[PDB]
Symmetry: C3
Subunit: 198 residues, 3 copies
């Protein structure tokens, strides 16, 4: 009440909390993720703020894709060692994460009834698509394709729920040139899914 | 009881609950519809999972359009004999519909103040548009146009509210060929409207 | 009382409540705006219904943009003298605005933690984009680009929070001709942002 209806990363973390590129090193961006319980659905709200030079310089290429993989255990806790996001989610505490135990965490998860694992005849049901935007140096909006796959494919036995968010573009010519590129920020993408029961 | 803040079809019903082709001899798809009260608005979340051969084979045509028509009486109850959806909505009970009386069903309906009946000067206000996606056998995303009309024209004196949802496409190439077609699934489309009062 | 979870214009005001075009005169349209508290986010739902002839005739041009500027003071109250919207927001009261004092009004505002003022290195984070639609005379849907900038740039000392919504299009040829143009109505655009704390 009402803070326990949100599970999130908090706002603008002081350091990179996410490793999106497998070639990184170490955390290479800030993943901002907010999940809000909305009746039978979750309202999910996600974007990235680039930190590493290699990540930011993706905007100099015409053909790119990168994926944040989020894996959760049987009670709705982020598995940080397996996931792109390396800091656990918690509830709302002002502009930050709370620090205690989670209330009803499993109820934030993508339902396995709506989004099954390993069922080929139903695999189309596991997908979400939309569009977000990169604000370019000339302040035009560069469209970025976003896809989300819910559950479908488990990494291993520990991972009871999965959210995989893939940003991509394939264009005639690129957001930015070497000297104009600054930070790869995506506009927030909001998507909805049927939630697992508490 | 947050369960009463949802009015929905339940998740993945056993059998087809919806007859969407007026060429069908019975229910031909699963209509998944979730309405959630969200302040002054309803958040509405809708897609189809095809069941009948003839419906699924629509994916082999390059030009298609089909519509789910939902009509409600003065107290917010689906009129199944009038509507594409042939099973009444009810509140959240886990992944399923509850089975009792409805609490404040009228409050899920599209406002007749925001979305009037038979006012030609305000007709433009009755329309919502967006895009959803079919996930093709080769895992590309095929864009489908979606339009919603709220109220505007009644079917008869019994219908106090209407939701009409039209999916359509017209491209050079069809989503599938005969040999690659399986099930016509649309990605969930979420739209918002100003809700009638309880 | 769920009514206090909404801050809005009410539905279809009797008279124009907004002056969008700087060449106007007086109020030239109805801004419909609904803000709903949704956990750590606000769900924002916005469109215009044109009233003045010059505003409605914008649809006869191929290259147009207009902006609703909404400025709020330090406790979340609309500054009507500074803003396009000239009538204060209030809570839900049926299809209308309530008339009493606001509960918690600052909590509807765009967070200055997520959406800072005057920080160049973070300016990309201040932007939201999407698409809405004008329903043309031939009942085709004409796409309109929408951008929202949150905070970023204060008008003056009074304006603690800013929401600026820009509608635009730049097309080969134009919604509408002099004799087909009627009312410029935009389909509702829903967007989300991280909210300031109560």
């Amino acid at each position: 009440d009402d803070n326990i209806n949100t599970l999130w990363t908090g706002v603008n973390p002081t350091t990179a909390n996410c490793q999106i590129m497998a070639s990184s090193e170490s955390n290479d961006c800030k993943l901002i993720l907010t999940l809000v319980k909305t009746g039978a659905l979750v309202t999910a709200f996600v974007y990235v703020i680039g930190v590493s030079n290699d990540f930011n310089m993706l905007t100099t290429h015409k053909n790119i894709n990168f994926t944040a993989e989020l894996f959760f255990d049987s009670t709705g806790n982020l598995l940080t060692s397996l996931s792109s996001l390396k800091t656990p989610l918690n509830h709302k505490s002002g502009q930050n994460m709370a620090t205690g135990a989670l209330t009803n965490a499993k109820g934030f998860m993508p339902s396995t009834t709506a989004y099954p694992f390993n069922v080929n005849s139903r695999e189309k049901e596991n997908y979400i698509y939309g569009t977000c935007y990169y604000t370019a140096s000339d302040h035009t909006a560069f469209p970025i394709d976003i896809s989300v796959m819910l559950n479908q494919r488990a990494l291993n036995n520990e991972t009871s729920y999965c959210i995989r968010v893939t940003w991509s573009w394939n264009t005639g010519v690129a957001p930015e040139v070497q000297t104009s590129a600054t930070t790869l920020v995506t506009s927030p993408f909001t998507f909805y899914y049927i939630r697992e029961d508490d």
